[PDB]
Amino acid sequence: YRLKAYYREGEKPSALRRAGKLPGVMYNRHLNRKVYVDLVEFDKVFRQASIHHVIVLELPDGQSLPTLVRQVNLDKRRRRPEHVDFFVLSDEPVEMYVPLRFVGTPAGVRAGGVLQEIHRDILVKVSPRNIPEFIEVDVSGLEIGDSLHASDLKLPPGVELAVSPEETIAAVVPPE
Amino acid sequence: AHKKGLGSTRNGRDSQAKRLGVKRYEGQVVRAGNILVRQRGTRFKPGKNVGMGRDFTLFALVDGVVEFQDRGRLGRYVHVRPLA
Amino acid sequence: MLMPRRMKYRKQQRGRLKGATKGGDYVAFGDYGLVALEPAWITAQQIEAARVAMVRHFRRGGKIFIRIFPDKPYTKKPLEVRMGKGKGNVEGYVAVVKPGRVMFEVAGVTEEQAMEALRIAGHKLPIKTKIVRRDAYDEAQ
Amino acid sequence: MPRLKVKLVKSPIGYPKDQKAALKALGLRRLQQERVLEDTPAIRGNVEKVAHLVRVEVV
RNA sequence: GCUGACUGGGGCCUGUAGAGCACUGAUAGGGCUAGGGGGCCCACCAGCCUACCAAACCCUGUCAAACUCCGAAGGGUCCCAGGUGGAGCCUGGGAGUGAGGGCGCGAGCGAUAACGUCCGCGUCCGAGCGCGGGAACAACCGAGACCGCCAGCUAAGGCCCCCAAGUCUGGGCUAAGUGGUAAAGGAUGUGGCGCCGCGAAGACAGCCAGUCGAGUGGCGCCGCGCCGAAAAUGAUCGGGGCUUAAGCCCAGCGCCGAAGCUGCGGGUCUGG
RNA sequence: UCGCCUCCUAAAAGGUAACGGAGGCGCCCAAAGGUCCCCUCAGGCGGGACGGAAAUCCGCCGGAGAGCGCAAGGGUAGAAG
RNA sequence: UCGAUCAACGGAUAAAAGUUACCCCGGGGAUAACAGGCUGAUCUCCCCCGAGCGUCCACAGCGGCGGGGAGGUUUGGCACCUCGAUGUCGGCUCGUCGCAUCCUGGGGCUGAAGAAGGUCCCAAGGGUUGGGCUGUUCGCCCAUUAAAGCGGCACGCGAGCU
RNA sequence: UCCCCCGUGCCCAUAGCGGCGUGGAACCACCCGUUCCCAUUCCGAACACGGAAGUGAAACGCGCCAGCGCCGAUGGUACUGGGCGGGCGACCGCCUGGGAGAGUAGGUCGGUGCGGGGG
């Protein structure tokens, strides 16, 4: 996951947008810089990476910064990204979301019901040098009655549950 | 020519407007008496050389110059720093 | 039919429709949206009609999420009457909708059924609609 | 100060009072009228107000 | 007798636009869950369950003129500068008006109807039905008409003929006379950008699949056009007539064009 | 419907119309007044003979949602209670 | 210092209700009824969506909930010319126009065997009757008919009549 | 000038909640009393007076901690002074000045004035 970034000086964002570029910024306790990326290339990436997976930004001085996304502001009308926030990581432990694996399908089928991925992902504290790929769930006996919430998870090394942990994650519910 | 029939409202009132508000601002010279604020509470609390009437009205106690002051949780004070 | 249970006030002023949606603009629940492309007042009868068509299509099937709610009252003087004599009587209720509002949403369904269902609903609505997916609509960290 | 030469080139008929007044302050009174003025901010301040009625030029 | 409008800098005052849900209410989906309904089931009163009604609490989503944890642009005001203006302030004589109208913006009423109606800020007509544009047309565009000229430069808007000035240049679209005034919605109408399927594991379409030997399909952005389009005296874009335009979009040069501006003479009023 | 008060409409000074939205007034208090000195609310969760789901009692938690004769708004416990 | 629902609350007298189609004057298109106009809610027509109807089968014939338009003949909304006058229903007489077509001419679908329908498409050239009832418009009815269309023209037409 | 406590102002939650450690020599409290002054709708609880055995348990002071609370950029948007455009309308768009609110990074378990007592 790599993206050619560029350095934004003070060119009206409008004009950059107009020209298929995507204005933005990068920051961390230490650096703060106006940047821009190209749209279609960023989307190609973000469409998978998103906020779950690191992106490496290639600036015009050859340097390659390891970053996470923290924000995608978008124009309600013409639902497109107006501006991207990039957080450049280092080594201090940083909070983020990590995707889940909804294995199989739930047993609530006779009453017409349908699964609700209330949490596709969960908030966790992690070091930048111990970032997991995913987390593994266990859905099978999720009937029209019962559900699951809290620290019912397979937490690997480097991970710290930064949620309640008492909070609903996926519930099967009646049809429309 | 068949005229439709209509009702009434039970609504059409408001009171006389009462011209509330600050009457002199920071850095207006004032004589003793000059009322400085017409208000419905302690929206401003009286400061140095500022009295307040039965109706919450703040007023200069001396011939001076007005200073305002926000003290957060203590509220807002109007003072008259005197010239002499 | 679809209205609040209480209101602070019974009648209220018409007002206006500045652009944008403010919020309710990204997906959030189901896996396919029906989005607004124009401002409008949408009436409860329309919402309902669309909703019913959705279900009727994937009969009793998946799930539906109605994301606009008619809180605004809709006045109208009696028929044939002249002007004045106070505001009119309340006839129904509307939901104020502005471009980029995700009005509906669906889950537990094939793209084929979904695509179609929504289209259908878009017909019952007195505005232009678009269909949506689940892109960078994941305002997280 | 690099003084200003401003010239009225569009009619203020239809425009707001303050703008018509602003022209007086300066002392533009006919169209095509040209005046050189000091470059002080009080003068500028008015000239910005009417920017759209005027050709502005430095001296 | 320089204090005016307006402007610059400083200082107060403010609760709208926007936004927000901390209060007041409204509200979607989920979890948890006081009561209540109701099934299990008994009066020893407990007890278990509920793809039912339903407080608070939690997660995720919203709404509000009479909600606000928040809050611009602006607005009001005082000080100090500029500002000699058919500015200001003061005292007195004479009035007319006290019936408004349109347009733009911001609200209410109305049906997000009306050459509707009611306020607010602005502007013009009124009194500028004097002048140029708009075919014609109080108030849309231009522009404030003391008088004269067989002089000149511009404004809006224009430069194929009526009709002054380009059948001007360079690049595209469009084939409907669209332009020459209508919507949901329909379409293998056109053109331009995008990104994927998947092609000597040689069926995309055609006759037994071999031959056939290549391009095939699917979305997504954008421009122009087509149908959707029926009313009553004779039609028509102002008219003739316009098709690599005399249409439309993008560039540029020159010209035409008012009672605007200049030139030249004259008049009058103010101040010097 | 006709005077007076509160709120909104009212476009962040003031002011602002309509047979626009929606409520109050035509009283009251000899203490519900002056001053001095004290005192601090509503709720919520326990716990306690008669005792409801708030009678009175105890303990925690509770900056204000209580209260301030009466409509609304403003204000207010560092009191106006 | 007192006597006011002088509350129509800046308070005409201390003291006051009706009617006029028997009516008069002065004014107003400042303000209603007729007509036109703007508007098109209502109204007439047509379209989009495709839950379902139709033994089977979304459209032969149909279309729930909803959606978008046209026309300007209804009832209205507004109050713009007209109150120093724009005669204001219907009838007759005379017409002329529109097509959203009631006959007649073409035509495609059909749940079209034939015959006869249904439905939509093209098409006003020409036609579109005589009576009973009501002032009627319209309507119902009688007997016919190829048919017995619907509208506009100031609800066409009173310096043409009634 | 440097500590620590005792008073007393200012800044106005970055001062707070909650946790955790400390401090009694001096201050301060809690404490010992209820004769006396003074008190309780009943209570020496509170207020008040006379004290000094005991404790820092409570309260107060000082440290650490970010779970909650509080503060919070930059960038980009919204909105808009003023200038101008499209649409039949709801409304949309371009210029030039101003520029949020939410949110991201991040920060915070206070700072300071005067006077006193103690090294």
* CATH code of the domain containing C117: 3.90.1170.10
Q: Is residue C21 part of a domain?
A: no
Structure-token pair, residue C71: 């809180």
* CB distance A142 to A172 below 8 Å: yes
Q: Distance of alpha carbon D3 from its chain centroid, rounded?
A: 13
Q: Is residue C10 part of a domain?
A: no
> How crowded is residue A110: how many other Cβ atoms within 10 Å of its Cβ?
8
* CB distance B69 to B77 below 8 Å: yes
Q: Is residue C14 part of a domain?
A: no
Using the Cβ of C23 and the Cβ atoms of chain B, whether some distance falls under 8 Å is answered with: no
Q: How many domains does chain C have?
A: 1
Cα distances (angstroms) measured from residue A102 to each of A116, A137, D25: 11, 6, 75
**Backbone dihedral angles phi then psi of residue A111, each to the nearest 5 degrees:** -85, 15
The distance (Å) linking the CA of B36 with the C1' of H49 is: 50
Name which of C62, C107, C141 is nearest A51 (Cβ-Cβ).
C141
Q: Is residue C56 part of a domain?
A: yes
- Residues of chain B positioned with their CB less than 8 A from the CB of C83: none
Cα distances (angstroms) measured from residue A5 to each of A14, A158, B68, C54: 18, 30, 51, 44
Q: Report which secondary-structure segment, H or E, holds D21.
A: helix D17-26
Q: Find all residues with CB under 8 Å of A21, minimum gap 6, and list them.
A: A6, A36, A37, A38, A39
Q: Is residue C117 part of a domain?
A: yes
Q: Is residue C4 part of a domain?
A: no
Q: Distance of alpha carbon C55 from its chain centroid, rounded?
A: 16
Q: How was this structure determined?
A: X-ray
* Nearest C-alpha neighbor of C100 from the set C130, C125, C73: C130
A114 contacts C136? CB cut-off 8 A: no
Q: Is residue C107 part of a domain?
A: yes
Q: What is the extent of the structural domain holding C75?
A: 29-137
HEC per residue, chain A: CEEEEEECCCCCHHHHHHCCEEEEEEECCCCEEEEEEEHHHHHHHHCCCCCCCCEEEECCCCCEEEEEEEEEEEECCCCEEEEEEEEECCCCCEEEEEEEECCCCCCCCCCCCECCCCCCEEEEEECCCCCCCCEECCCCCCCCCCCECCCCCCCCCCCEECCCCCCCCECCECCC
Which burial class, exposed, middle or buried, applies to C100 when counting CB atoms under 10 A from its CB (0-12, 13-18, 19+)?
buried
The CA angle A58-A61-A66, to the nearest 5 degrees, is 35
Q: State how far the Cα of A150 lies from the Cα of A124, in Å rounded to an integer.
A: 13
Q: State how far the Cα of A60 lies from the Cα of A5, in Å rounded to an integer.
A: 7
Protein footprint on strand G: which nucleotides are under 7 Å from a CB? Answer: 32-34, 41-42, 48-52, 64-68, 75-79
Cα torsion through A92, A7, A2, A91, rounded to 10: -10
Q: Report which secondary-structure segment, H or E, holds C93.
A: strand C89-97
The distance (Å) linking the CA of B54 with the C1' of G2 is: 30
A94-101 and A135-136 beta bridge pairing: parallel
The CA angle A52-A55-A60, to the nearest 5 degrees, is 160
DSSP-derived letter for residue B15 is: P
Query: Which three-class secondary structure state does DSSP give residue C129?
Result: strand
Q: State how far the Cα of C89 lies from the Cα of C131, in Å rounded to an integer.
A: 36
Q: Find all residues with CB under 8 Å of A124, minimum gap 6, and list them.
A: A95, A96, A97, A98, A159, A160, A161, A162
DSSP-derived letter for residue B26 is: T
Starting at the earlier edge strand, list the strands of the sheet with B58-60: B21-22, B35-38, B58-60, B50-52
Strand partners, A26: A33, A86
- Resolution value, angstrom units: 3.3
DSSP-derived letter for residue C13 is: -
Q: Is residue C111 part of a domain?
A: yes
Q: State how far the Cα of B36 lies from the Cα of B47, in Å rounded to an integer.
A: 11
